């Protein structure tokens, strides 16, 4: 019994089932049991599963949790499988796979590459009479756009920039700063005004009713109820590949735009979108590795995936599936190519303590948006606690 688990929304679950069925057709001795959840529920269910020694054989993994699992003896080093050809890396440049490495070991195999984007509903932009001039626009331009969208189109100008552990670090990079120290022992940025400026802007957007309160965001059941899909927001902040799921769930014309203020500091990164990992507890490690190889290198399988989990890490596969892509699937490839004319290498995997820092920043953001703590005070409390968490590693 080969257990395979991932996070995502309905569009991802639909074709992943077909990829699994295709693997079983080609390998009829294999019976796969699939397990899936949305992002939040996925990590919540995975943690006590790992404590019980019951992780699935193939785990969809994120860089933000790679060290949390890999430095706590949960994950198998995949390097033997790349060395003996079980997972073929001949068409994968090793620089893409390094997003799954912790020090010397390969704890996750990168499945794709993506780039942060501002995704917009073109019909709602037109309703408000507004446009995005993506090459050069500023955070101030974005805030004005969000007010224009609420005042003139009656919709949000932000989906919430959720979660803060993605978009506050993006803001830091637009200002030439960094969230984590390279050694992982504390926060890199030293000027609390950066935190204050970011969360003051979030508070203004919420108070102007152009961005959701935490209680509204918590109501979102699954991807079909996300703001961009229901038309409650004209704007959503997501990775390039996530455009595809949205485009399959709404008829509205959606576009990918470069986020504000990426130009000067090359704030965007070519990020490992997600990974597959194998737990040390697995009784089917070789079969799990063979499934990973199939997922990344099989062209037929990738004609079902169509970049929904990121641009394929195999250049051979990524170019071979381009003729199969339709307009919306091609829009993502075009966006990544455009962003890549001014982009940075991804930062290494997040340090141990990332999982606790993520929740700390979400909790702190909630308190700011409910006006229970000022951004000035929260900057200080966040730094103190984040550094207490990180100094353990
Ligand atoms: C922007 C959010 O970043 C991460 O919290 C997480 O991204 C991971 O998943 C995916 C993916 O599922 O394709 C790509 C990234 O490379 C991963 O690190 C979230 O999934 C991601 O976006 C969330 O998307 C949902 C979509 O319904 C909501 O819009 C939610 O508010 C976003 O946080």
């Amino acid at each position: 019994t080969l257990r395979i688990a991932w996070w995502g929304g309905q569009p991802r679950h639909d074709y992943t089932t077909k990829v699994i069925e295709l693997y079983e057709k080609k390998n009829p001795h294999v019976h796969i049991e699939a397990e899936f959840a949305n992002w939040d529920d996925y990590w919540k269910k995975l943690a006590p599963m790992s404590a019980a020694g019951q992780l699935p054989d193939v785990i969809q993994m994120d860089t933000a949790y790679l060290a949390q699992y890999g430095k706590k003896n949960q994950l198998e080093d995949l390097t033997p499988y790349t060395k003996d050809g079980t997972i073929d890396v001949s068409s994968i440049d090793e620089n893409m796979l390094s997003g799954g490495k912790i020090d010397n070991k390969l704890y996750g195999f990168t499945l794709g590459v993506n780039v942060l984007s501002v995704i917009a509903n073109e019909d709602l932009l037109k309703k408000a009479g507004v446009s995005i001039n993506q090459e050069n626009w500023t955070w101030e331009d974005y805030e004005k756009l969000a007010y224009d969208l609420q005042e003139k189109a009656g919709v949000y100008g932000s989906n919430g920039m959720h979660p803060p552990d993605i978009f506050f670090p993006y803001y830091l990079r637009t200002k030439g700063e960094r969230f984590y120290k390279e050694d992982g022992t504390g926060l890199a940025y030293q000027d609390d005004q950066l935190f204050v400026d970011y969360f003051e802007r979030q508070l203004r957007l919420v108070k102007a009713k152009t961005s959701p309160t935490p209680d509204e965001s918590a109501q979102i059941k699954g991807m079909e109820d996300d703001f961009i899909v229901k038309g409650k927001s004209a704007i959503t902040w997501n990775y390039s590949n996530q455009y595809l799921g949205f485009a399959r769930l709404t008829d509205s014309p959606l576009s990918l735009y470069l986020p504000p203020e990426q130009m000067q500091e090359k704030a965007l990164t070519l990020k490992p979108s997600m990974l597959f990992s194998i737990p040390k507890s697995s009784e089917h490690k070789k079969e799990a590795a063979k499934f990973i190889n199939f997922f990344v290198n099989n062209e037929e399988a990738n004609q079902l995936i169509k970049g929904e989990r990121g641009v394929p890490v195999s250049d051979k596969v990524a170019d071979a599936i381009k003729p199969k892509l339709n307009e919306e699937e091609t829009n993502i490839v075009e966006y990544v190519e455009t962003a890549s004319k001014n982009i940075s290498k991804a930062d290494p995997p997040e340090p141990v303590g990332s999982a606790e820092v993520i929740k700390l920043l979400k909790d702190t953001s909630d308190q700011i948006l409910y006006q229970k703590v000022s951004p000035e005070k929260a900057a200080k409390t966040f730094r103190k606690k984040a550094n207490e968490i990180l100094e353990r590693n």
Side-chain angles (χ1 to χ4, degrees):
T1 312
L2 192 66
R3 291 170 53 217
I4 305 188
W6 66 90
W7 77 82
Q10 182 82 27
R12 176 172 298 160
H13 311 324
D14 286 348
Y15 78 78
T16 304
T17 298
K18 295 283 161 272
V19 170
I20 280 165
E21 289 167 9
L22 175 60
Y23 190 79
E24 295 174 324
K25 285 178 171 66
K26 301 170 130 47
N27 302 271
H29 61 275
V30 172
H31 168 70
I32 287 160
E33 297 183 325
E35 316 171 352
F36 57 83
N38 62 39
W39 167 268
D40 285 337
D41 291 335
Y42 183 82
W43 299 110
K44 162 185 245 154
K45 297 177 206 280
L46 209 66
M49 253 190 44
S50 73
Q54 285 167 328
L55 288 167
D57 304 286
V58 179
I59 308 163
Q60 201 173 272
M61 178 55 51
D62 193 72
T63 63
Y65 291 93
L66 185 64
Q68 201 77 35
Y69 281 81
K71 286 182 70 162
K72 302 195 156 109
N73 204 40
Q74 296 303 294
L75 304 186
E76 193 65 31
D77 178 21
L78 306 177
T79 308
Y81 297 114
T82 62
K83 281 175 166 175
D84 71 5
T86 301
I87 304 169
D88 167 42
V89 294
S90 60
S91 300
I92 307 175
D93 40 332
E94 311 241 322
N95 311 108
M96 317 264 275
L97 296 192
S98 59
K101 290 186 76 211
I102 301 171
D103 302 311
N104 265 357
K105 305 299 223 312
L106 184 67
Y107 288 114
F109 203 92
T110 295
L111 305 184
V113 58
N114 59 8
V115 182
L116 282 174
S117 71
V118 167
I119 292 163
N121 180 329
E122 293 288 335
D123 279 342
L124 291 173
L125 296 187
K126 294 179 214 122
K127 183 183 199 316
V130 297
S131 72
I132 295 174
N133 302 116
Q134 65 173 358
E135 292 85 11
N136 40 32
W137 64 327
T138 65
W139 285 113
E140 293 76 15
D141 293 336
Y142 170 68
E143 181 169 350
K144 173 79 184 332
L145 178 80
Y147 298 145
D148 286 339
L149 282 166
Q150 166 60 26
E151 294 183 340
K152 300 180 68 196
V155 299
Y156 291 162
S158 177
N159 70 303
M161 292 177 63
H162 180 74
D165 63 90
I166 296 306
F167 294 103
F168 176 49
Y170 172 72
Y171 177 84
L172 288 172
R173 287 187 55 100
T174 71
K175 305 307 186 170
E177 306 274 345
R178 297 297 187 267
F179 190 62
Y180 290 123
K181 284 175 173 188
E182 300 167 71
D183 66 20
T185 66
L187 299 175
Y189 77 99
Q190 295 305 304
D191 189 353
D192 285 339
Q193 193 63 47
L194 290 155
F195 180 111
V196 172
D197 284 349
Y198 180 87
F199 286 101
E200 276 183 352
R201 176 165 287 117
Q202 294 302 308
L203 184 50
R204 292 191 300 266
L205 297 172
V206 170
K207 283 208 272 222
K209 323 287 166 203
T210 201
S211 188
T213 67
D215 275 294
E216 186 181 3
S217 299
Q219 281 178 43
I220 303 298
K221 313 67 175 182
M223 190 171 291
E224 328 210 339
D225 283 17
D226 209 348
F227 298 102
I228 196 75
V229 175
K230 296 292 281 195
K232 177 72 164 257
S233 180
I235 296 284
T236 194
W237 291 73
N238 293 92
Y239 290 95
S240 49
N241 64 297
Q242 301 189 276
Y243 172 93
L244 189 42
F246 295 145
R248 295 180 174 168
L249 292 169
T250 178
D251 70 290
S252 293
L254 306 182
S255 299
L256 300 108
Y257 291 89
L258 297 170
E261 281 187 48
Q262 53 79 32
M263 171 158 294
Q264 291 311 130
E265 297 288 352
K266 295 190 150 193
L268 292 170
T269 71
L270 216 48
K271 189 186 118 149
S273 60
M274 57 190 81
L275 310 94
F276 274 147
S277 297
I278 302 173
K280 292 179 159 176
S281 57
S282 174
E283 307 207 294
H284 308 294
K285 292 178 163 99
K286 180 65 142 207
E287 196 70 54
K290 290 165 78 139
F291 179 86
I292 296 179
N293 183 60
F294 162 85
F295 201 93
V296 296
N297 285 309
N298 189 264
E299 295 201 4
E300 185 178 10
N302 275 274
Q303 296 175 313
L304 299 165
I305 303 162
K306 294 158 152 13
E308 194 277 330
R309 284 176 160 94
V311 175
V313 287
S314 163
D315 297 340
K316 175 180 172 307
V317 171
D319 288 342
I321 62 165
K322 281 185 190 170
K324 195 62 192 204
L325 309 179
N326 69 8
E327 171 130 339
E328 292 69 36
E329 293 147 7
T330 302
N331 286 346
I332 301 165
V333 174
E334 303 189 351
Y335 175 77
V336 174
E337 287 178 350
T338 287
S340 70
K341 303 171 190 123
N342 191 63
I343 212 161
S344 294
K345 316 85 153 150
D347 297 304
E350 286 74 4
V352 179
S354 164
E356 196 173 351
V357 171
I358 283 172
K359 186 66 179 16
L360 166 67
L361 188 60
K362 173 55 165 136
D363 292 342
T364 302
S365 176
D366 287 354
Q367 294 184 267
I368 288 163
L369 296 180
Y370 276 130
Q371 300 181 292
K372 299 173 71 168
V373 62
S374 68
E376 287 78 7
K377 173 112 174 71
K380 294 164 190 305
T381 65
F382 172 71
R383 172 181 303 283
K384 183 175 172 297
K385 178 64 166 314
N387 280 344
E388 286 167 359
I389 291 158
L390 296 165
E391 66 160 14
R392 302 180 222 181
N393 73 50

